[PDB]
């Protein structure tokens, strides 16, 4: 995902993952360099915790 | 440098560093994703080992 920072440069990004995995994955993506877009991510409330 | 992979996409790149540091730095750049360009790097023989 550190290599995939180049392909995640969007004003709005759709995200559909497992929320149990996503507490690890979102911190990984914040350490990738996507913290400024980390507030601009979409989940449904069922996918959300 | 993992973030700086995007700004090192050139057919030929000039490199001027310390060769004592460069045995660490070049392996770092290979783990960044620049191994395919790792054979296309320039040093003088004085900068080289």
Element (H, E) at A30: helix A19-32
Element (H, E) at B28: helix B19-32
User: Solved by what technique?
Assistant: cryo-EM
Give the distance from residue A4's alpha carbon to the nearest chain B alpha carbon, in angstroms. Answer: 10
DSSP B5: G
Which one of A5, A28, A29 makes the best mutation probe of the B interface by having the most chain B beta carbons within 10 Å? A5
Phi, psi angles (nearest 5°) of residue A42: -110, 130
DSSP A14: E
Lookup result for tokens 């054979």? B39
Distance CA B14, CA B31 (A): 19
| 3-class DSSP assignment, residue A15 | coil
Enter the resolution in angstroms.
5.2
């Amino acid at each position: 995902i550190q290599n995939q920072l180049k392909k995640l440069q969007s004003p709005i990004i759709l995200l559909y993952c497992t929320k149990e995995e996503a507490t690890y994955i979102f911190e990984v993506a914040n350490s990738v360099g996507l913290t400024g877009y980390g507030y601009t991510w979409i989940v449904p409330s069922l996918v959300a915790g």
